[PDB]
Design a protein around this ligand. Structure first.
Ligand SMILES: Cc1nnc(C(=O)NC(C)(C)c2nc(C(=O)NCc3ccc(F)cc3)c(O)c(=O)n2C)o1
Ligand SMILES: Cc1nnc(C(=O)NC(C)(C)c2nc(C(=O)NCc3ccc(F)cc3)c(O)c(=O)n2C)o1
Ligand SMILES: [Mg+2]
Ligand SMILES: [Mg+2]
Ligand SMILES: [Mg+2]
Ligand SMILES: [Mg+2]
Ligand SMILES: [Mg+2]
Ligand SMILES: [Mg+2]
Ligand SMILES: [N+]
Ligand SMILES: [N+]
Ligand SMILES: [Zn+2]
Ligand SMILES: [Zn+2]
Lengths: 184, 368, 368, 184
DNA sequence: TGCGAAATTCCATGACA
DNA sequence: ATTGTCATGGAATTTCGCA
DNA sequence: TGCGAAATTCCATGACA
DNA sequence: ATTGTCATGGAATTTCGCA
């Protein structure tokens, strides 16, 4: 069996709805399986159309052999199947109600939801602008299991933005009683 | 003047007037019988005016001016006086072309790492496609890997929108650009400082300095053209295709595609290379580091037989950038403050401002 | 196809497939173990399609196309198939640049006599001066002697007005011009035939062919510029001055002014030459005839290391003259009917019209 | 004494008034003394101004050492004297009522008046257009005294328009009784 | 240990406004 | 305070297959 | 029959849209 | 059925003045 590689498998998923930010409601999340590298795309809907639009950007940089997803409507449509077939991409589905990624990916997907949550409180409407820094953060985060960040695994070099503070990532007591104030 | 010429008439010797010729008076003027014929020897106090009159007929250079004077006059070392005047003619100095070429080009070192240096530039205006007229091209110096963004204008704001998206992937140490309005605005300066990105500018009117990206512009236009043969020029929808196409194209001299240089492994695109299928990613990155350092690098070509290289303190002239019709192609003379490298200099321009300038936009002032 | 590949699998020898390698079956496809790795040997009936797919990714040339194919496949003489396709790609053939230079320039003989050949051309538009925008420049081929006429347009009618005045002095055998609207109109053709004047045209988009007058344009603009430094660009009143100035300026290589070449004696202008003061006019004209024949004439320079010269029947392509943005720079291939001289040819253009054309506006079609 | 040369002396004079042709009334006549070469310029008046305008054209081709003329108002004005002095041209006047040129020039001036007269009858208003051919004629006319035309003496070559017919130059009987009809 | 032919490398040419 | 670049396709050179 | 310096010639460079 | 040209100013070469 051949060793795992970048572009072997992309794990995709939607997060949202979120508070509107510049007319956007959702985030499509792409994580490379081997490197843990993350790409994020703002969409207005979890539709096949928005997925195709966003993946067209990504897949004009690099094309995965396999895309893995749950059985979301946007991912099981025959349009989305056409699109993938055109690009020679094999589609892969986790059985319904049983999401299976990998340890690395699950942990990454967890970091994403939590890092988002942390930064959306205080400024729940300014997230669109923060997506770039969110990604840099995620991608220059040290992996306990491998000695390396996703940046390093993807490109084979150190980054010009090392995130030296392994950050709090937990909700400070101020944000706990004021996150329960925004949802009131 | 009349002192010298007098001593001469009575047959005495003056340095410069050869003794074997006969010098006489006739019609109130001192003459001499030279092999070509009889010429008037004007008094030295008259010679500047003569040279000036001859020169001014058509503002001629050395020989063409001499030949006029020689029709009527002779004196010692005529050309020295001619050259003296040529060197003082404002009009000739700022209108004539140079006849000395630039020194041979530099081949700066390839950036060591992806993201060490971006080169950016605009292409356009292009025929309107979905309301878009320009393309922002961003080319990573080390890899050649290129990013393409359609814009409505070559503006700072559209530059910033695009780069926010690109730098989601990684932040570069340096971004190199030419002197476009978009790149030199203080808004853009701020945007870069905000991210610890250093801005580097080409000398003005020297697109070769952005050669990395300019050259990529060529391929981008060339592929767009081919794809659009016999169709209307709807380029907007092909940008992504072109980007991918080019990033995955081999440079025959290197034997690598920019993709390979950036990632050390092909993604799922046609004809993907498989040579590293049995290496670990770590083994793969190790072979990549080695491939990255051993890439072919060209050397500075031989100088042409009549080039010049700048010297501190030299009088040189900067080309007028957008000269109006029937106006000089050169600015007034100015002085070389610093030789930054053999192809780049700082000059004090007589105003006088410091300007950093390519020698391609300079000539050495003639006659010193 | 499957016939060949079969014989091969059972260990028999086919011309082109070297015998020292092991050829096997795996995953339903014929493979071979080459030094670089294991490659698929597609059936010959598949190869065109493969080459085509590789080429079409970015419309690459020989090596860049080969390198893609080589990632997956091997077969005998791969590049021959690659080149076959490159030679059939309409899009590449009409979009790519040439990489072969033109043959060395011709230095046509100097017209033997004043009035044997005029070269005419327009300069402009210039900044308006007394309602005038253009200058008609007429340059006698033999002497260089030049006439200047201000016009409001580069029109046939204004051309005719001017030449009626010039030809008061003498009628020329031939007038050479480029393909300007003014010179190619049937009204102008009539005007010339009326006077027994033969019209000669440059090939299109090749101002070098009018080099005699183009070069004079340079001096005319250069002197005008100098005279106008620090003043408003009121050139109309300087035309006469400039004309006279230039006609009486020495060419250092020749050692004569155009005036001298035309008349054999200076008129009453500054620094008039006097060497023939003691000859009769007839003695003078005799020395003129001799000066006229012995003038320096340059030779054809050495060819560059990679030039081409046209052969009857060759496939060549004409440059698109005013190509729209993102459109090919070359027309479709066409054939050389006649090699007029080594730098000039007649071609049949596939429409097909006969066109007389400079090789500077041609490339040899690549890959035959 | 040095032999005579082209540009040594220009002989100038006016002819007219003539019937208006394209708004013109006079012809300034310039004849080079040595070659007999002729230039003609149409003017609207025998004024200093019109002379200067016309000679500016000529003297932008070649400049004479001396201009000879009778004592016409246009030639004796101080403006015309300034103009000549500026160009280093010596002015020369025949004493009043006693015009003296040279044999060659007088004969040439005669040819001009007669050739004009001949061509103006029949078309007394179309002369402006004929000035060019008039000059070519005059300048490619064989000189009995010298073996050469003015063209040949000026340029040192044969011309591309030889005027092989030494022409009638006399008024044919049709033109005699119809030249007395135009002046009726 | 050397031949013919194919493969690879060299590099002038030209175009990015 | 900065600096030319590189696809291209014939030709020149090297390597390959065989002996 | 030779030296130093001035004169002349050579010629690459660049510009005519 | 047509085709490059030539001013320019440093450098290279030749000639000049003298002996
Ligand atoms: C200050 C200042 N203001 N303006 C300039 C300036 O440079 N202006 C021009 C019009 C010359 C320009 N040109 C290019 C370019 O691509 N030219 C084509 C080319 C490319 C490569 C090569 F080697 C030769 C030519 C640009 O990209 C560009 O932005 N500009 C502004 O500087
Ligand atoms: C058919 C047909 N339609 N149009 C052409 C055509 O030639 N068009 C252009 C715009 C190129 C042009 N150029 C020049 C010229 O002077 N160019 C500058 C130059 C001079 C010398 C040198 F060596 C290089 C460049 C003209 O005089 C001229 O009349 N034209 C029309 O052919
Ligand atoms: Mg989901
Ligand atoms: Mg630019
Ligand atoms: Mg550019
Ligand atoms: Mg023209
Ligand atoms: Mg022209
Ligand atoms: Mg009179
Ligand atoms: N460098
Ligand atoms: N010729
Ligand atoms: Zn000057
Ligand atoms: Zn193609």
């Amino acid at each position: 069996d051949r060793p795992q590689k970048p572009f072997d498998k992309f794990f995709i998923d939607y997060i949202g709805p979120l508070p509107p930010s510049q007319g956007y409601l959702y985030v499509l999340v792409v994580v490379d399986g081997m490197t843990g590298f993350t790409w994020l795309y703002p969409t207005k809907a979890p539709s096949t159309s928005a997925t195709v639009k966003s993946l067209n950007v990504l897949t004009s940089i690099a094309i995965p052999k396999v895309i893995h997803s749950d059985q979301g409507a946007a991912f099981t449509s025959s349009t989305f199947a056409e699109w993938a077939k055109e690009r020679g991409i094999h589609l892969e589905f986790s059985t319904p109600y049983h999401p299976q990624s990998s340890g690395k990916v699950e942990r990454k997907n967890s970091d994403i939801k939590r890092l988002l949550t942390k930064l959306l409180v205080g400024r729940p409407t300014k997230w669109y602008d923060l997506l770039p820094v969110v990604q840099l953060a995620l991608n220059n985060t040290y992996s306990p299991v491998l000695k390396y960040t996703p940046h390093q695994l993807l490109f084979g070099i150190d980054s010009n933005t090392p995130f030296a503070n392994q950050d709090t990532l937990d909700l400070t007591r101020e944000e706990e009683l004021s996150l329960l104030q925004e949802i009131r | 003047l009349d002192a010298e010429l007098d001593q001469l008439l009575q047959g005495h010797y003056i340095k410069g007037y050869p003794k074997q010729y006969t010098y006489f008076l006739e019609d109130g003027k001192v003459k001499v019988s030279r092999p070509e014929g009889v010429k008037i020897i004007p008094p030295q106090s008259d010679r500047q005016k003569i040279v000036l009159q001859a020169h001014n007929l058509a503002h001629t250079g050395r020989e063409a001016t001499l030949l006029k004077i020689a029709n009527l006059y002779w004196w010692p070392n005529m050309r020295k006086d001619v050259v003296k005047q040529l060197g003082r003619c404002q009009q000739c100095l700022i209108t004539n072309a140079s006849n000395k070429a630039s020194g041979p080009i530099l081949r700066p070192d390839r950036p060591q790492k992806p993201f060490d240096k971006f080169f950016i530039d605009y292409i356009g205006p292009l025929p309107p496609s979905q309301g878009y007229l320009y393309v922002l091209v961003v080319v990573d110096g080390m890899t050649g890997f290129t990013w393409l963004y359609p814009t409505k204008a070559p503006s700072t704001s559209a530059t910033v929108k695009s780069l926010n998206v690109l730098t989601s992937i990684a932040i570069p140490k340096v971004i190199h650009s030419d002197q476009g309005a978009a790149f030199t605005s203080s808004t853009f300066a701020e945007w870069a400082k905000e991210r610890g990105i250093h801005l580097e500018f080409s000398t003005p009117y020297h697109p070769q300095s952005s050669g990395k990206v300019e050259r990529k512009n060529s391929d981008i236009k060339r592929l767009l053209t081919k794809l659009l043969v016999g169709r209307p020029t709807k380029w907007y929808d092909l940008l992504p295709v072109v980007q991918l196409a080019l990033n995955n194209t081999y440079s025959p001299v290197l034997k690598y595609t920019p993709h390979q240089l950036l990632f050390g492994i092909d993604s799922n695109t046609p004809f993907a290379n498989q040579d590293t299928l049995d290496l670990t990613r770590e083994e793969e990155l190790s072979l990549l580091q080695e491939i990255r350092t051993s890439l072919y690098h060209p050397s500075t070509p031989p100088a042409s037989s009549r080039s010049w290289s700048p010297v501190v303190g030299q009088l040189v002239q900067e080309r007028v950038a957008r000269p109006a019709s029937l106006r000089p192609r050169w600015h007034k003379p100015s002085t070389v403050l610093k030789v930054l490298n053999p192809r780049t200099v700082v000059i004090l321009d007589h105003l006088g401002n410091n300007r950093t300038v390519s020698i391609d936009n300079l000539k050495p002032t003639s006659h010193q």
